[model samples]
Target: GSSGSSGDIVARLQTQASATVAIPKEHHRFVIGKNGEKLQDLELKTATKIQIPRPDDPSNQIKITGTKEGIEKARHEVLLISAEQDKRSGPSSG
Candidate 1:
């Protein structure tokens, strides 16, 4: 029984993946939160490496690297934050 569990753990360790999530440039601030606390928390929770472009960067896609499950979770979290920010900002003004 212990052998089977170890095998599963090894398999999981070898399973790696990456994903890129596109978010509104304006919402990047919300995703990062104040002092990068939000980004740090998200990375810890998902156990993944997340790369957000610098403020001056023209790219709007965030890159997440880790196991497939972790990547998906991070992506979802980013989208959720973006949505929440959008709601709080209300409708666009012009």
Candidate 2:
């Protein structure tokens, strides 16, 4: 007797994929924006899951997973934003 019940679960990762971008930990805030602004919408717009390494984690490689197109766009903008904030280094009270 052969009783099968291990049916298929739509196994097709397809175009969706993941990638890592080496961004500075300092830019995490800017990436997420002030009060969950940037990253939140960036996710919506790009439709990608952008993950950042935690402070305690001690890693700056931000991982983004989603449509390949979104992945490319998100990474570009992310790096751009980081660069903009990069010059904000040192002490500046404002």
Model 2 TM-score relative to the real fold: 0.73
Best by lDDT: 2
Per-candidate total of colliding backbone pairs: 0, 0
* Model 1: per-residue Cα lDDT over 16-44, one tens digit each: 77889888788887778777798888898
| C-alpha lDDT of all candidate models, in order | 0.82, 0.84
RMSD of 2: 13.1
The true-versus-predicted C-alpha distance at residue 33 of model 2, in Å, is 1.0
